[PDB]
Amino acid sequence: RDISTEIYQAGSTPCNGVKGFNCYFPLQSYGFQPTYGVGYQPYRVVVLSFELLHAPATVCGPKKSTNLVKNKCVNFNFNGLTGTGVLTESNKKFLPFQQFGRDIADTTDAVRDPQTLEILDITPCSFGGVSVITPGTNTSNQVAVL
Amino acid sequence: DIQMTQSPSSLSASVGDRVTITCRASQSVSNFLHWYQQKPGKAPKLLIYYASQSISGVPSRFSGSGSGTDFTLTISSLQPEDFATYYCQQSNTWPLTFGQGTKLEIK
Amino acid sequence: QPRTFLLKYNENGTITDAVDCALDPLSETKCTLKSFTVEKGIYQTSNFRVQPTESIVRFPNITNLCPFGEVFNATRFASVYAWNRKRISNCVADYSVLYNSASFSTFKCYGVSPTKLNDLCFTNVYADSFVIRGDEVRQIAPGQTGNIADYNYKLPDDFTGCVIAWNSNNLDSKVGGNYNYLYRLFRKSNLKPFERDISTEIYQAGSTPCNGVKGFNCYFPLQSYGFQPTYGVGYQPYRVVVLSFELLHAPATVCGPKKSTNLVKNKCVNFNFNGLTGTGVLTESNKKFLPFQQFGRDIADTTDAVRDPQTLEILDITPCSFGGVSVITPGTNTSNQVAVL
Amino acid sequence: FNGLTVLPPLLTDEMIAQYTSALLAGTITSGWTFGAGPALQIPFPMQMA
Amino acid sequence: AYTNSFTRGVYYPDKVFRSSVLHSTQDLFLPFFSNVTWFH
Amino acid sequence: AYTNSFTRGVYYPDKVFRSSVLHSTQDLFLPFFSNVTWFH
Amino acid sequence: NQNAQALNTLVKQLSSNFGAISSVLNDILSRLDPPEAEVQIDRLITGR
Amino acid sequence: ALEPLVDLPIGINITRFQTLAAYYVGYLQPRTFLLKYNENGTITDAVDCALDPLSETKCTLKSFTVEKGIYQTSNFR
Amino acid sequence: LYNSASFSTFKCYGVSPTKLNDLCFTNVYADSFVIRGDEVRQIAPGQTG
Ligand SMILES: *[C@@H]1O[C@H](CO)[C@@H](O[C@@H]2O[C@H](CO)[C@@H](O[C@@H]3O[C@H](CO)[C@@H](O)[C@H](O)[C@@H]3O)[C@H](O)[C@H]2NC(C)=O)[C@H](O)[C@H]1NC(C)=O
Ligand SMILES: *[C@@H]1O[C@H](CO)[C@@H](O)[C@H](O)[C@H]1NC(C)=O
Ligand SMILES: *[C@@H]1O[C@H](CO)[C@@H](O)[C@H](O)[C@H]1NC(C)=O
Ligand SMILES: *[C@@H]1O[C@H](CO)[C@@H](O)[C@H](O)[C@H]1NC(C)=O
Ligand SMILES: *[C@@H]1O[C@H](CO)[C@@H](O)[C@H](O)[C@H]1NC(C)=O
Numbered sequence: 001r002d003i004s005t006e007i008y009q010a011g012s013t014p015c016n017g018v019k020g021f022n023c024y025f026p027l028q029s030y031g032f033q034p035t036y037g038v039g040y041q042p043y044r045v046v047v048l049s050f051e052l053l054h055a056p057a058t059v060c061g062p063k064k065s066t067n068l069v070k071n072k073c074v075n076f077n078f079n080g081l082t083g084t085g086v087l088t089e090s091n092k093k094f095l096p097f098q099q100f101g102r103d104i105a106d107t108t109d110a111v112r113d114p115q116t117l118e119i120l121d122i123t124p125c126s127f128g129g130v131s132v133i134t135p136g137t138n139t140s141n142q143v144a145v146l
Numbered sequence: 147d148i149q150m151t152q153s154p155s156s157l158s159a160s161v162g163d164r165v166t167i168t169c170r171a172s173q174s175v176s177n178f179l180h181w182y183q184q185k186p187g188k189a190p191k192l193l194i195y196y197a198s199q200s201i202s203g204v205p206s207r208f209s210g211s212g213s214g215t216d217f218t219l220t221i222s223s224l225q226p227e228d229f230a231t232y233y234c235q236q237s238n239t240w241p242l243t244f245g246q247g248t249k250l251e252i253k
Numbered sequence: 254q255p256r257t258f259l260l261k262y263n264e265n266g267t268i269t270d271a272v273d274c275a276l277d278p279l280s281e282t283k284c285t286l287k288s289f290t291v292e293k294g295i296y297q298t299s300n301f302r303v304q305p306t307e308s309i310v311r312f313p314n315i316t317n318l319c320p321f322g323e324v325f326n327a328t329r330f331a332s333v334y335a336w337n338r339k340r341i342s343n344c345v346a347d348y349s350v351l352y353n354s355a356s357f358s359t360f361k362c363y364g365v366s367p368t369k370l371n372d373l374c375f376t377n378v379y380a381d382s383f384v385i386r387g388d389e390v391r392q393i394a395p396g397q398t399g400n401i402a403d404y405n406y407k408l409p410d411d412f413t414g415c416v417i418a419w420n421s422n423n424l425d426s427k428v429g430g431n432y433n434y435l436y437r438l439f440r441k442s443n444l445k446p447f448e449r450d451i452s453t454e455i456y457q458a459g460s461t462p463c464n465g466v467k468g469f470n471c472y473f474p475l476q477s478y479g480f481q482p483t484y485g486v487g488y489q490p491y492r493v494v495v496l497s498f499e500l501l502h503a504p505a506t507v508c509g510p511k512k513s514t515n516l517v518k519n520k521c522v523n524f525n526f527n528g529l530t531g532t533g534v535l536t537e538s539n540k541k542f543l544p545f546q547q548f549g550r551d552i553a554d555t556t557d558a559v560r561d562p563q564t565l566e567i568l569d570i571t572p573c574s575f576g577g578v579s580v581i582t583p584g585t586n587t588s589n590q591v592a593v594l
Numbered sequence: 595f596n597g598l599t600v601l602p603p604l605l606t607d608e609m610i611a612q613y614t615s616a617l618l619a620g621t622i623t624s625g626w627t628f629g630a631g632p633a634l635q636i637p638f639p640m641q642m643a
Numbered sequence: 644a645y646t647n648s649f650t651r652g653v654y655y656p657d658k659v660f661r662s663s664v665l666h667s668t669q670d671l672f673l674p675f676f677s678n679v680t681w682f683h
Numbered sequence: 684a685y686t687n688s689f690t691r692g693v694y695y696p697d698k699v700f701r702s703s704v705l706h707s708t709q710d711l712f713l714p715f716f717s718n719v720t721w722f723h
Numbered sequence: 724n725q726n727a728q729a730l731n732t733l734v735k736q737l738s739s740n741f742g743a744i745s746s747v748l749n750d751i752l753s754r755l756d757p758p759e760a761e762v763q764i765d766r767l768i769t770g771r
Numbered sequence: 772a773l774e775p776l777v778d779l780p781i782g783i784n785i786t787r788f789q790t791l792a793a794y795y796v797g798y799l800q801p802r803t804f805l806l807k808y809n810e811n812g813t814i815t816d817a818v819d820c821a822l823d824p825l826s827e828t829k830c831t832l833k834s835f836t837v838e839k840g841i842y843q844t845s846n847f848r
Numbered sequence: 849l850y851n852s853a854s855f856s857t858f859k860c861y862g863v864s865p866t867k868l869n870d871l872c873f874t875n876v877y878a879d880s881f882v883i884r885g886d887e888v889r890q891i892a893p894g895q896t897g
Contacts, residue, residue, distance in 0.1 A: 011353045022355045030884060039886040047891065049877035050862065056658070059876050061869035079872035093266060094660055101660035110660065147322065173323070240326050257669040258653070266662045271653050273675045274667075287665050376782075504780040530749045542700050543812050545775050549700030553734035555595055558700065576599055595734055688797055693804065693817045694773040701808040705833045707820070708806065711799040715819040719797040758894040 053080075056099040068113065073125040078111045083122065090121035148173055148236060152245045158253050159224055167248045168218045169234040178237035179217045181210055184247075185230045194219055196237075226252050259284050278580045279591045293584040295594070302575040305523040305532050312511035313527065314563045319344040319507065321351070324380045330425070330492055332434045333405055334475070335451055336383035346378060347371070347510045357419040363395055364413030364498070371509030378507050379447075379497035381406075384434050386478060387420055388487030393495065404437055409446035413500070418493040422482055425490035430479040434490070437474040447497070513563065521573040526559045531570065538569035644681035648673060684721040688713060741770035772814035805830045857888060 009015070011022030019025050032042050057079035073086055081100070090110055092101065101110035110121050133144035152169035159165045171179075181194040192201050194210035197217055210219040217234065231247040257274040270289065272280035278298060282291050285298045319341050331337040348370040352360075360367050385393075385401055392401035395412040402408070408416075425431060439456040455463055459470035467473055480490045516522075516535065523532045529548055540549065542560050551557035558569050579594035605613075620628040625641045627634040652673025692713030713719075740746050743763045744755075751763045805818040805826075820830035824844065828837050831844040850858070850865065858865060883891075890897040 011355050022353075030882075037885075041885045043883050043885055043888070044880075045883055045891060046878065046880045049879065050873050051875055051877075052863075053874055055874035057872040057874050059874065060872035063870060077870075080870075092660065092662065095266070095655075097655070097658050098660045099658065101662075104664070147326075238328060239323070240328060254671065254674055255669065256672045256674055257667065258672050260653075260656075260666050260668065262661050262664050262666065264663055266660060268653060268655070271650075273672070276675050284667065287667065503782045506780040528750075530747070540700065540702065541811050543695075543774070545695070546698050546700040546812065549702070549812075552704060553595075553731045554738045555734060560700075572596060598730065598734075686795065690817070692773075692797060692799075693806075693814065695775060695814065696804075696806075698775065700812045701806075702810050702812055704808050705835070706806045706808060707803060707830060707833065709801065709803045711801055712804050712819070713797050713799055714802055715822050717797065719795045721793065721795055723793050756894060756896065 065115065068116075076111075076122075078108075079114065081108060081111065083108060085122045085124045088121045088123060090119050092119065092121070094119060147241065148175070148239060148243045150234060150236065150243045150245050152234060152248055154248065155246070156249055156251065158251050160253060161224070161226055163224055165221050165224055165250070166218060167232060168216065169245055169248075170217070171215050171236060173239070174215060175217075175236040175238040176213055179212070180235040180237065181219055182233035182235060183228070183230050184233060185228075190233065224250075257284065259287065261289065277591070278578070278593050279582065279589060281578075282580045282582060282591070290585045291582050293582065293587065295579050295581055297577045297579050299578045300575065301578050303521040303573040305521050305573075307517070307520075308514075308523040308525075309516050310512065310514040310525045311516065311527070311562050312513055312525075314513070315345050315510060317344040319346040319378075321346065321380075324382055324494055325351075327382075330382055330384050332436075333383035333385055333401075334435050334437070336381055336406060336449060338449075339380045339382075341378040341380050342507050344507060345510055346375075346507050349510065351417065357417060359390055359418055360415060361394075362415035365415075367415070370415075374505040374508045375499045376501075376503035376505045376507065377499055381495045381497065382493070383495075384425060384490060384492050385436065386487070387485075387489035387491045389491065390418070393418070393493065400438065401436075403443045404440035405444070407444045407446040407448070408495070412446075412497075414496050414498045416493075416495055418491060418495070420486065420489050421492050422489050425492065426480045426482045426484075428482060430477070430481055431490070432477040432479055434478045434480060435475055436478060438476055439472050439474045516561070518568075524559075524570075527562065529556065529559065531556060532573060534571040534573055535568045536571060538567050540567060540569070542567050644683065645678045646681045648675065648677045648679045650675055684723075685718045686721045688715070688717045688719040690715055737771065739770060741766045743767060772817075803830065805833065807835060861893065 005027060007015070007017075007019060008024050008026045009022065010024065013022065015021065015023040030042070032040075060079060068087070071086060071088055073084070075082070075084055076087065078100070092110055094101070094110075094112065099112060100108055103109035108122060110119065112119050131146035133146055135142070149172040150169070151172075152167070154167075157165070157167070169179075177197060179197040180192065181197075182190045183193055184190040191204075193204060193208070194200055197210055197212050200206065200209065207223045207225070208219055208221040210217075212218050229250050229252060231249045233247060234245040236243065259272050259274065259280075260268050261270045263269050272283045272289070274281055274284035279291075281298045282296050283289055286296060320339070321341075324339060324341075352367065352370065362370070365373060383406060385405070389401045391397055392399050393406075393408055393416055394402075395408055395410050425434065437450075439458070440450070441456065444450065453475060455465065455467070456472050456474050457463060457470070458472065461470075463471035478490075480488075516524075518535050518537070521532070521534055524530070524535065527547060538558050540558055542549065542558075547560050548556055549558040549560075556570055558567060560566070561568050581592035581594060583590075620633055622638065623635050624633040625636050627636075654672075656668045656670050694712075696708045696710045738746055743751060743766045745751050746767065748764060748767065752760050755763060803820040805820060806814050807816045807818075809815045816835065818826050818829050818835070820826060825837075827844040828842045829835060831842055850868070860868075863871065887897070889895050
């Protein structure tokens with residue numbers, strides 16, 4: 001915010017206090033009349049600047065809460081943090097200023113919950129490639145699956 | 147700011163001859179130039195104004211012509227009592243600039 | 254201070270030890286190796302380069318200055334019926350002498366900003382000049398209509414240019430009236446922008462055409478201002494020099510001034526030669542340039558030499574010395590003393 | 595050029611030649627016994643024999 | 644009076660848990676072995 | 684009349700100093716051994 | 724010859740525009756705004 | 772090698788021309804040239820890359836002396 | 849805020865307009881001022897004036 005009222009110097013010689021020769025006052029007025037057009041009308045701007053996670057999350061929405069379930073593959077939403085995994089008990093003793101734990105390469109490892117402050121661990125759900133043992137279609141269609 | 151020059155600097159003349167002195171401007175003064183005459187110990191007087199026209203009340207032994215950046219007058223009948231330093235004066239741009247002088251001398 | 258640390262966390266979840274990345278090259282090696290224990294050998298930690306100490310700006314010398322003295326400093330400004338258009342081109346136009354002096358009070362440059370004017374490259378400047386009444390400041394503007402706008406001289410709706418004008422009372426006012434300056438009240442056509450109606454026809458209003466005589470409902474449009482020094486500021490002489498601009502039709506030939514900077518040799522500088530920029534060490538050369546060439550390039554399009562403006566010297570561009578920073582260490586068991594290559 | 599450096603080799607050109615002169619002197623003097631253990635000299639007709 | 648800062652001035656960066664990981668961050672830290680000003 | 688243009692008609696394309704180097708450029712040029720038309 | 728020609732190709736690909744208005748980074752910063760000069764720089768970054 | 776003299780920013784469209792006892796009028800076409808620069812900076816010899824396939828090998832290899840062998844220089848379509 | 853038809857210039861970059869309640873934001877900087885009528889374009893990231 002530039003609230004200062006120092007006069008602007010343009011051409012050559014600094015006046016330093018007198019509005020005059022090459023010395024214009026920086027704060028000039030709108031001067032709104034209702035006879036003006038829509039490109040001259042007032043416009044009450046209210047801009048809502050966010051940052052997306054410089055801080056712990058404080059401004060949530062009006063969506064209803066959901067009861068928690070233990071040791072199952074769920075799609076959780078931890079104050080805007082959307083992810084998948086199972087939610088198990090954890091023995092990681094956090095200091096009370098942490099709100100979430102972070103793993104290697106921008107993946108979230110442990111989150112403490114809203115309304116309860118009980119610590120949870122995020123482990124991803126069980127995945128893996130599938131593989132087929134076959135003797136060939138010329139011999140038999142019996143398939144072992146790995 | 148107009149570098150106003152004239153050639154020749156010191157030229158001689160005789161009785162009753164036809165002399166031609168020119169005076170040149172750096173920038174275009176196309177139709178506004180005045181011609182003066184100055185005897186020693188005497189204030190000048192207009193001779194030719196706007197490089198073509200002449201003042202009423204001057205002896206018409208001379209006439210002036212020229213445009214662009216080349217200006218002159220021709221004295222068709224010179225007399226020995228002149229011997230004076232001739233001056234040009236433009237009228238186009240500030241500041242107003244004179245010439246150095248063409249002093250006429252008798253042999 | 255904005256430093257970079259390397260924190261070691263624990264099985265508790267607490268910080269045990271740390272190093273500073275900018276303290277010494279040993280902990281710089283610990284930062285770039287991401288461990289507290291370095292082994293015996295050589296490691297490249299960072300890149301060293303010589304910074305530009307100061308910059309030099311170079312541009313060709315101004316020997317072709319634009320005729321702004323012929324359009325501002327003139328004895329006879331032509332009137333608005335015979336407003337004088339001069340095309341200003343093939344030179345360098347200085348608007349800083351215009352903006353830095355305040356004989357005027359009414360800049361109001363529509364389109365381009367009044368401040369940033371010497372940097373933009375225009376192509377064609379139309380310097381018009383006319384003298385109007387003192388209260389007609391609002392009429393010379395895009396969009397505004399009236400006598401001076403509609404029937405005298407129209408500025409266009411998308412006008413890009415400055416409306417430079419000073420209100421002079423000493424020069425163009427004669428005691429008794431300067432009747433040389435003239436304007437039109439009555440005209441049967443709204444003038445399109447950049448048009449010049451010098452015709453002296455008789456205006457017919459009511460019923461019957463006069464056609465050569467003057468009388469009842471037949472007004473001569475050519476009427477005098479009649480400037481007097483005892484008038485107010487709305488009736489004072491008002492000397493206008495309006496400058497029209499590019500309108501995207503030509504290549505650029507009229508530009509703003511460019512301040513030259515004195516060169517220093519054998520140092521790492523950030524140079525600018527005729528629009529070609531770069532960072533390097535300038536030194537003398539024995540390479541014979543042909544007289545039309547401005548800069549020389551080596552193998553694979555790297556500028557090896559440049560011809561110096563304003564003195565016709567040939568300067569060799571050597572890039573500033575750079576290399577990786579190598580740290581000799583015996584290992585953290587042996588010693589903490591390091592050597593830097 | 596910009597961003598390009600050429601690292602010098604650790605073994606120089608006058609000193610790779612010292613290895614080749616050492617291998618030549620060891621070969622001509624001793625056959626192949628310097629490649630096996632200690633350098634045992636031999637006359638060169640007996641070596642070529 | 645002036646004192647060496649030694650190896651003090653180390654804090655937690657961004658209120659986030661991390662365990663047994665050599666982590667590099669760039670924040671406003673106190674430099675090691677710098678001069679602090681002593682008032683008594 | 685017509686004449687073969689031989690190897691004439693080569694200008695400096697870019698006003699750049701170049702030394703001991705083979706340079707390939709793509710501007711408008713007169714082709715070698717083309718028909719140049721002879722007038723009187 | 725292969726090493727010097729690979730280095731000469733590596734220097735010679737700095738002159739490529741990669742679809743941008745010019746290949747000189749200071750030239751495309753000196754006359755353009757930041758958030759279109761961003762995508763003009765980014766083409767040169769991914770090409771080089 | 773023909774040196775430049777002037778560069779005039781006129782920006783007017785030119786389509787036909789006329790000349791004020793004998794002269795040659797040739798026409799320019801957008802073809803690639805290989806230019807040999809001397810140590811002083813002047814052009815010593817030049818090679819038109821669209822004249823014959825020997826000059827296509829010269830413009831491909833960027834040399835005025837080609838060695839013995841086979842060179843893939845262009846594509847027939 | 850979204851269902852109020854008094855506004856005509858909601859005009860939201862960053863987070864998309866239609867899914868806005870579902871995220872939980874941390875710091876919301878509700879600034880407020882009054883400007884000249886055709887200066888809608890200058891309050892935008894990048895457009896200058
Ligand atoms: C149009 O005319 C004006 C007025 O003559 C020019 O403005 C500058 O005015 C000042 C004083 O009025 C003068 O500056 C002089 O500079 C010299 C050298 O520094 C100094 O020795 C003198 O004592 C004096 O201060 C001079 O008339 C003029 N300055 C110049 C020409 O550099 C104005 O430049 C003219 N041209 C335009 C395009 O406006
Ligand atoms: C299928 O297998 C049998 C014996 O293994 C073989 O004789 C036969 O040729 C095979 N079929 C084909 C199409 O190769
Ligand atoms: C806490 O720190 C101690 C000290 O090294 C460590 O032995 C222990 O494993 C940590 N964790 C717990 C849960 O006590
Ligand atoms: C020092 O050496 C010992 C064995 O010689 C090793 O166990 C120890 O880890 C080393 N210290 C380090 C790498 O900090
Ligand atoms: C280069 O120019 C110098 C002086 O003009 C001359 O002596 C020399 O022979 C030239 N080198 C050539 C033509 O290879």
